[model samples]
Target: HHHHMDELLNRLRQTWHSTIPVSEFMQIAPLSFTDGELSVSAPLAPNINLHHTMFAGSIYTIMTLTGWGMVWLQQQLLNVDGDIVLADAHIRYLAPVTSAPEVKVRWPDTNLSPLQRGRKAKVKLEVQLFCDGKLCAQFDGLYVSVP
Candidate 1:
């Protein structure tokens, strides 16, 4: 699983790097990939600011990307390749992120085999973003994995 995670992260980083400059993208740095979890940090930039706090869209972007990346990681580990899309996502903003200004997103612990046991599966992943060890945002998403 760890090997697959490494491969998936490399692929994702390559794709993102080719499309977006890492400097301009706050979420590109401080990316940590672990078994079944991917955490990315967002540097505090002028564009991500809204009244001195992080913008709503920036928060949402981190949450969405974190969830999407986790699903991609799962597929890679399952040794199955397919197109996955976010069926739905609900986000809740708890507090204003200021101190660290970095986002740490994590996925719940679950059995992966059952998730990819069939040709198609509905995998719902719960993600939470923390800033300076405080919960600032959360996302619950349903992803559809298709063959």
Candidate 2:
């Protein structure tokens, strides 16, 4: 499959652009979508730090967004879209994301396991990152819901 489907893309955008502060700050938006691999992008013009590379914090924000986004999309596919929150996250600066700054985050590329959707109102979601066509420096995040 490719990236985000049209209607779902619109919904995700409306949700983030209106609610997420960093999303507005960095002007991040969904640019691509798939199962475990989903993407949200921000222009370099607004995302660079003094050193002129993708800012570390922005990378982290996008990481959580994609992780949460992928988790959301997977649920939608199963006709049970649930809420999400950044449960935990961490990343490592490998090389540097200086390419097309379009960030893609990946969940585990296997079966999207069952979690009672929201029985405990909590679920774990895994995610990584990508720049250009290769995986971005590095990304990881776990998303869950509040009980």
Candidate 3:
């Protein structure tokens, strides 16, 4: 099961890489996924920093991608297709990320009832960004499915 998940994740990464250039994508790296959680990492470079630390916009960009990617992964697992859009999002800066940063987004371990029901549903996800394993920022997002 885990191998299958990895394969799917790799496929998604490849697809994104093919469609989006790495330069504009901020050179983010897809880390891993497990137990409904997805992790991504990006180095703090001139293009992605406000001054010395990771920029807030960069943080939001990563979180947004993570949320969308997780939802797409869920749809893949359920073998269903639906339009998913961000309903709302909130981000909190816990600390200044002065180094390379990593973001981990976790979708609640529910049964994916909303997708199964074949009706519009809202799914909430929590994303945390860390620098060297320390919390740097956090995001809470709601994604809605449209039939």
In TM-score terms, which candidate is top?
3
**Candidate 2 lDDT over residue span 1-147, tens digit each:** 134387887778777878877788787778876555676777766778787878888877776776777767767776764567776767886656774466665655434444443443444554445667666656666566432
Which candidate has the highest lDDT of all? 3
Q: What is candidate 3's TM-score against the reference? A: 0.83
Please provide TM-scores, in order, for all candidate models, with all chains considered together.
0.76, 0.77, 0.83
Global lDDT of each model? Answer: 0.66, 0.67, 0.76
User: Clash pairs of candidate 3?
Assistant: none
- Candidate 2: Cα lDDT at 131: 67
For candidate 2, which ten residues in a row score worst on lDDT?
Answer: 114-123
**What ranges in model 2 sit over 4 Å off?**
1-4, 107-118, 121-126, 132-134
Q: Write the per-residue lDDT of candidate 3 for residues 2-23, one digit (tens) a residue.
A: 3326688777676566766852
For 67-118, candidate 1 gives per-residue lDDT tens digits of 7677767667668776678889898999987744444445565445644556
Model 1 lDDT-worst window of ten: 22-31
The local lDDT score (0 to 100) that residue 11 gets in candidate 3 is 70
